Chain A
């Protein structure tokens, strides 16, 4: 039994266009442990990205936090791209601008 990653994309603080903030991608509940995560701006990979070490849950699945400093605008779209053995192709999850 393999478990595909839950992928959640959200800002550190309530978002507002033109205000400095942090974009988070929390990748969790996956098993086995090999995984690939990227933050995207308008479909292109962001290079200055922080991430936690692989973490262990009591239910034996794994989790990870990726993040980068950002200033949200109406024009710019942000997303989190994840690959995992449960996925045929990398999944691109779009930030809702909400919150």
Chain B
């Protein structure tokens, strides 16, 4: 199926007494794999299959790198605030990563945000930065003048990131590549007099990606469907639902298996 690896950074200027100034967390798919912040000042594993398969040297090396990245992030956020003439607490964020799709193709992405909004977005295919405004445009011109760094980022997204992901996928395969099929039921109830709500509910499934819809016999999708979020149930599995009201049938697809419930 589709898998992804990504690393986030978050920088907060003038943080409250409890909030750290800098946090970095990595993910494989929906699973945290690594964590670092300005208080621990240590990069640590966040999944046992990460801890068990990477030697201490890995954590020690990336700890040193993160301590450097933390300082840069603080300085970059200060410069951004100055450009915008902003005072008080603001945020700066980075996301880098890649996906390996089932069909074999890959994606890579590298993006920055300021105060939780898109700021700069890297296009690895064109080797250029998209800027949302003139401040980002200022930063863009600096970065685009550095040809080697752009090439390095492209190479990391397309080759290194993908190799890390495959490696991590193998480490956590018993978790990441398992399948737990959904438990699906359809509930019926007259709500407001004259209107019967139909809920198609799924739970107990992994991976979280699931497709759910309602169809009217025979096969036409209709029409004002309400979708429930895919939510973690706490035991590593997920739950979700879709509802309509009024021959209907709920259709569920999960991990290559299709399910139909006639109402």
Known contacts A1-B117, A8-B231, A12-B235; is-contact A56 B19 (Cβ 8 Å) = no
Asked whether any CB of chain A lies closer than 8 Å to the CB of B218, the reply is no
Among the 9-residue stretches A30-38, A76-84, A88-96, the one with 4 or more Cβ atoms under 8 Å from chain B is A30-38
- Closest-CB distance, A64 to chain B (whole angstroms): 10
Asked whether any CB of chain B lies closer than 8 Å to the CB of A61, the reply is yes
- Chain B 21-50, CB-CB to A under 8 Å as 1, else 0, gives 001010100001001000000000010000
Known contacts A32-B91, A60-B116, A99-B201; is-contact A53 B229 (Cβ 8 Å) = no
Report A-chain residues with C-beta under 8 Å of the C-beta of B180: none
Among the 9-residue stretches B8-16, B136-144, B252-260, the one with 4 or more Cβ atoms under 8 Å from chain A is B8-16
B203 touching A33, Cβ below 8 Å? no
Report B-chain residues with C-beta under 8 Å of the C-beta of A1: 115-117
Asked whether any CB of chain B lies closer than 8 Å to the CB of A75, the reply is no
Residues of A within 8 A of B (CB): 1-3, 8, 10, 12-14, 22, 24, 26, 31-34, 50, 53-56, 58, 60-61, 65, 67, 99
Known: A26-B232, A56-B8, A56-B27. 18 other contacts (CB 8 A): A1-B115, A1-B116, A12-B233, A12-B235, A14-B203, A22-B233, A22-B235, A24-B231, A32-B12, A32-B115, A33-B12, A34-B15, A53-B25, A56-B25, A58-B95, A60-B117, A60-B118, A67-B234
Residues of B within 8 A of A (CB): 6, 8, 10, 12, 15-16, 18-19, 23, 25, 27, 32, 35, 46, 89, 91, 93, 95, 113, 115-118, 201, 203, 229, 231-235, 239
A-B contact pairs, 24 of them (CB 8 A): A1-B115, A1-B117, A10-B231, A12-B233, A12-B235, A24-B233, A24-B234, A26-B229, A31-B115, A32-B12, A32-B115, A33-B10, A33-B12, A34-B16, A53-B32, A53-B35, A55-B25, A56-B93, A58-B6, A58-B95, A60-B113, A60-B116, A67-B234, A99-B201
